[PDB]
């Protein structure tokens, strides 16, 4: 077997699990983008990327088992449900959480506003490059990827222009301009700094915990700070197992996933390498929920929202990453970056149309709302009486008029017949509304 | 474009009429010397680019004519015929106008550059230039030198810029919000000026 997982997960534990099952594990960089263009037997990744793969057909529709379905949490199965079919085996539930230093501070900050004072006193730093880490602050005040109504995601409605998204992004860039976080800090810098204790607190998921455990500095895992009196809403990840469409060993890989990996022993051997977080298996999750960090992850997931499985999530992630990088580096303002994100999300726009709208946003931000409205309009456009019978000696015919009274109606008909040179006896049928003159 | 030409010619006519009346009557009583000082400072600040980069003979010639006529009016009021001038009734505080106008020019200007700051300051000071004259007439109650021709030409000047702004906004799609607002303030002040003159002098 050939397996691709991210570099920050427990690839060694997966290696021993495959050893007991040959199974090869690899952790290429940018694999969430490598996989579609390259096509590995089974790929381990968050569910948001998987639905788009199912649109390409790269993931083979796998028939589940009712007992095996009941062996896992129902919402994890709901995550990998796209158009009524299951495309992946959920493995773990991961959510972002605050990891602070007990030595540096006893109580974590209850809100984002407290962070500037504590940081300037110490004189927080997380990975600002990926939008996954910077999204909880954006979504704390109502910014959303796609409007979720009655069980469906409305692609026509994107909430990255919300006042809450603007507030979160401007708070982040204010903290950047106040020298509280390095504009170009990334995951490696965040891990290195928090391991040495230089940074009191950082935002990260379960996987980093083992790394922090190597740093042997006492750390507390808890709720992400609230932004303007509202909780942070991190996207909830479901690390799931997807089968390749072109895998020659589809049945063997499926059996391996069901009978070695998604078991108590296999998941225990995987979580030891790197903390999987909230485990999909009922038994191991019950055995593991007693740990306070797992409880913090689960409650943060409850405060957050799970990512949509729709295929418009890769474009959304690219657009939000571009906007966050632009706002953080200072190349562009917050509002301009969010308008760029909206333009880049719009799927039906042609490349040259999108470039034109982006240029229009660049060179005049006073009418950004009107430019966005016109771009959305273009995007939606490119989405894939009384009657007379006369019987004379020479002329015969019929004629209809608009009359409310029959007396005036027959007066008009008599005048018309005189104008037509007609002279004869008159009859009226009121039921048929017909005046008949005949000679 | 003829509306702005006609308004500027009417303003120059008003200035020339006032200067000639002061010269002929051998007195400047009834005129606020502080208002004319503010007008002179408006023309000085707006036309400081007279020395450098002349655009046309009409342009620089009109700038020089305005500056010279206003300076001559100030000289006649304060130097030549200062004996007839009555500063007792012209007690208005000029700094109370210049300082807020300077601050407002710093704050509300389009762009923060010395020439743009100077132009905005001149526009605002022109908008509030006539206030000392209004106060002087409101106190004394008469204007021995203000004439019907002067007021008529000033009102024609203001109405011509009003028509010019409407024409530019509706045909050329151009409006200068600072200029429009300051001109509206000046037009209201001039209407009050005409009201005071007709009700109290005539």
């Amino acid at each position: 077997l050939v397996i691709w997982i991210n570099g920050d997960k427990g690839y060694n534990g997966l290696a021993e699990v495959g050893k007991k099952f040959k199974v090869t594990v690899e952790h290429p960089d940018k694999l969430e983008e490598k996989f579609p263009q390259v096509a590995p037997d089974i790929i381990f990744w968050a569910h948001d990327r998987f639905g788009g793969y199912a649109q390409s057909g790269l993931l083979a529709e796998i028939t589940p088992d009712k007992a095996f379905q009941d062996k896992l949490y129902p919402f994890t199965w709901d995550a990998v449900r796209y158009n009524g079919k299951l495309i992946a085996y959920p493995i773990a539930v991961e959510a972002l959480s605050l990891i602070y230093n007990k030595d540096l501070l006893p109580n974590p900050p209850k809100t984002w506003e407290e962070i500037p004072a504590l940081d300037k006193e110490l004189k927080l730093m997380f990975n600002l490059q990926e939008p996954y880490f910077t999204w909880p602050l954006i979504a704390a005040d109502g910014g959303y990827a796609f409007k979720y109504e009655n069980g469906k995601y409305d692609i026509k409605d994107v909430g990255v222009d919300n006042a809450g998204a603007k507030a979160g992004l401007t708070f982040l860039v204010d903290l950047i301009k106040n020298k509280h976080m390095n504009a170009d800090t990334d995951y490696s810098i965040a891990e290195a700094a928090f391991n040495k204790g230089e940074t009191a607190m950082t935002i990260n998921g379960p996987w980093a915990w083992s790394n922090i455990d190597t740093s042997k500095v006492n750390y507390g895992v808890t709720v992400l700070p609230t932004f303007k009196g509202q909780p942070s809403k991190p996207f909830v990840g479901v690390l799931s197992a997807g089968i390749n469409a072109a895998s020659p060993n589809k049945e063997l890989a499926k059996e391996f996933l069901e009978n070695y990996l998604l078991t108590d022993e296999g998941l225990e051997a995987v979580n030891k390498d790197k903390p999987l977080g909230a485990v999909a298996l009922k038994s191991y999750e019950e055995e593991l929920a007693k740990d306070p960090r797992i409880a913090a992850t689960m409650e943060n997931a409850q405060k957050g929202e799970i990512m949509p499985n729709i295929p418009q999530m890769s474009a959304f992630w690219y657009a939000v990453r571009t906007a966050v990088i632009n706002a953080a580096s200072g190349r562009q303002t917050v509002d301009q970056a969010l308008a760029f994100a909206q333009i880049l999300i719009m799927p039906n726009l042609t490349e040259e149309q999108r470039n034109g709208f982006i240029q229009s946003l660049k060179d005049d931000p006073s009418v950004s709302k009107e430019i966005l409205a016109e771009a959305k309009k273009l995007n939606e456009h490119q989405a894939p009486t009384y009657k007379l019978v006369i019987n004379g000696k020479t002329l015969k015919g019929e004629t209809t008029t608009k009359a409310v009274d029959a007396e005036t109606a027959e007066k008009a008909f008599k005048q018309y017949a005189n104008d037509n040179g007609v002279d004869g006896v008159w009859t009226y049928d009121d039921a048929t509304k017909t005046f008949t003159v005949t000679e | 474009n003829i509306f702005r030409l006609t308004g500027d010619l009417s303003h120059l006519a008003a200035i020339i009429i006032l200067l000639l009346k002061i010269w002929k009557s051998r007195s400047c009583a009834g005129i606020s010397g502080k208002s004319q000082l503010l007008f002179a400072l408006v023309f000085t600040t707006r036309y400081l680019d007279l020395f450098t980069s002349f655009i046309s003979l009409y342009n620089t010639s009109m700038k020089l004519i305005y500056i010279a006529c206003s300076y001559a009016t100030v000289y006649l009021i304060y130097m030549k015929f200062k004996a007839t001038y009555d500063g007792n009734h012209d007690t208005f505080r000029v700094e109370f106008l210049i300082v807020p106008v300077g601050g407002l020019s710093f704050l509300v200007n389009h762009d923060f550059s010395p020439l743009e700051i100077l132009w905005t300051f001149s526009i605002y000071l022109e908008s509030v230039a006539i206030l000392p004259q209004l106060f002087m007439i409101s106190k004394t109650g008469e204007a021995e030198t203000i004439t019907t021709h002067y007021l008529f030409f000033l009102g024609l000047y203001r109405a011509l810029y009003l028509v010019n702004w409407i024409w530019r906004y509706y045909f050329e799609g151009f409006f200068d919000l600072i200029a429009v607002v300051a001109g509206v303030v000046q037009t209201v002040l001039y209407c009050d000026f005409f009201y005071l003159y007709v009700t109290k002098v005539l």
Partner: nanobody, 121 residues
Framework: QVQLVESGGGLVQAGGSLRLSCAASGFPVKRWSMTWYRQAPGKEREWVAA????????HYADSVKGRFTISRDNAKNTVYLQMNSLKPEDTAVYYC??????????????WGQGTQVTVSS
């Protein structure tokens, strides 16, 4: 004397994009205003967009607001009009007009030759 050259016009499909540019040659003025007009055959000349020399002020016609965007380049002494989501009703000859916004400069009012924009439905 100032000469105005307009470029960027051409034939574009409906819904496409275009970028017009008015470049002024001659001695620049401290304060000027440039207005993009359009004239279709047999129709009156209507203003499309308007920008000044300094500031963030831009004005757009009701028909083109949100689709057309006017910007300036003082360093290059140029003004650009970006046309997005073009429709065949936007077929016309587009002119650029430079006015001296300073005092006593009524005859500093220069027009471009004209550029042809044709939206093929």
């Amino acid at each position: 004397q100032v000469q105005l050259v307009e470029s960027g016009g051409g034939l574009v499909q409906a819904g496409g994009s275009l970028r017009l540019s008015c470049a002024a040659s001659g001695f620049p003025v401290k304060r000027w205003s440039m207005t993009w007009y359009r004239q279709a055959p047999g129709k009156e000349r209507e203003w499309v967009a308007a920008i000044r020399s300094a500031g963030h002020w831009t004005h757009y016609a009701d028909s083109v607001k949100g689709r057309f965007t006017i910007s300036r380049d003082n360093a290059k002494n140029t003004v650009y009009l970006q046309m997005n989501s073009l429709k065949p009703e936007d077929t016309a000859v587009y002119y650029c007009n430079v006015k001296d916004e300073g005092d006593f400069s009524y005859w500093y009012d220069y027009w471009g030759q004209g550029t042809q924009v044709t939206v093929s439905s």
